[PDB]
Symmetry: C3
């Protein structure tokens, strides 16, 4: 059970923190959205929220990651929501399949329930 602080950036100017699946998973188009396990857990740094986005090299290989919002105070496991677009896609364990982007959480007076 690992916190977001254990994630790494590919390069200094990389916007995203790499996310890997902890399991070998095969996806087919007819399966629809699948939630892939990462072994990485919220919560996020104060005043930030997360966006899970695809890596372009993985998108172009036919695996769509659905953009996912990670709430600031989520303490569960970050999962990647993914779908094989046209073809059979195989994710090997430890392959980098998504990225976590951190963004400022703007305060508003919207009511909270």
């Amino acid at each position: 059970k690992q916190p977001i602080s254990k994630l790494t950036r590919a390069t200094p100017g990389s916007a995203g923190l790499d996310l890997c699946s902890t399991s070998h998973t095969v996806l087919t188009p007819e399966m629809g959205p699948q939630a892939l396990s990462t072994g990485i857990y919220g919560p996020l740094p104060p005043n930030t929220f997360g966006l899970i986005l695809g890596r372009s090299s993985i998108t172009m290989k036919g695996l769509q990651v659905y953009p996912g919002v990670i709430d600031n105070d989520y303490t569960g496991e970050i999962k990647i929501m993914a779908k094989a677009v046209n073809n059979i896609v195989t994710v090997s364990q430890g392959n980098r399949i998504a990225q976590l982007i951190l963004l400022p959480l703007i305060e508003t007076d919207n009511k909270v329930q």
Copy 2:
């Protein structure tokens, strides 16, 4: 006709403001992108823009929300662009199907036309 200020957050640390459809809508894969009415209108707080994203529980049920950019000064109705991925999806009136994220609008010197 309701402003974004009438939206609510599920919880204090929730990144997104919940968006519901004002209509019962059935979607099938062959229908392609459909714009669902929300009865909620721009514009956005100063120096912010909006991103419409899916709720993960709804994505995993086979309804894809296409990420949508809400411009700061848009004064029209915020619609959710949505597609049934694989199966027939039914949206009941008032079910929460998307979320609005507010983000800082960065100024640039890019020319404006």
Copy 3:
């Protein structure tokens, strides 16, 4: 070879900078994700990263742009990752098919490799 500074905003309050394809491209659903050339190159303003998102009018016409992360220091050509959802889509040269959003790049102590 044109920098992001040559991009234009539709309007002052437009969140996104317009991206056009430099080629006439026809897309069919069975083709899967295609990377469309823009002739526009990184890098991004300091402390920012980019998100490529669809234009709603183009999404509703059946062309899905996969959200793409542009790293701050990417110096290559910005490409639009796109897919025809259900039908045959034709992109004419110079038609605006996506938008670039600029966002703050938050610093973290995540290790960098």
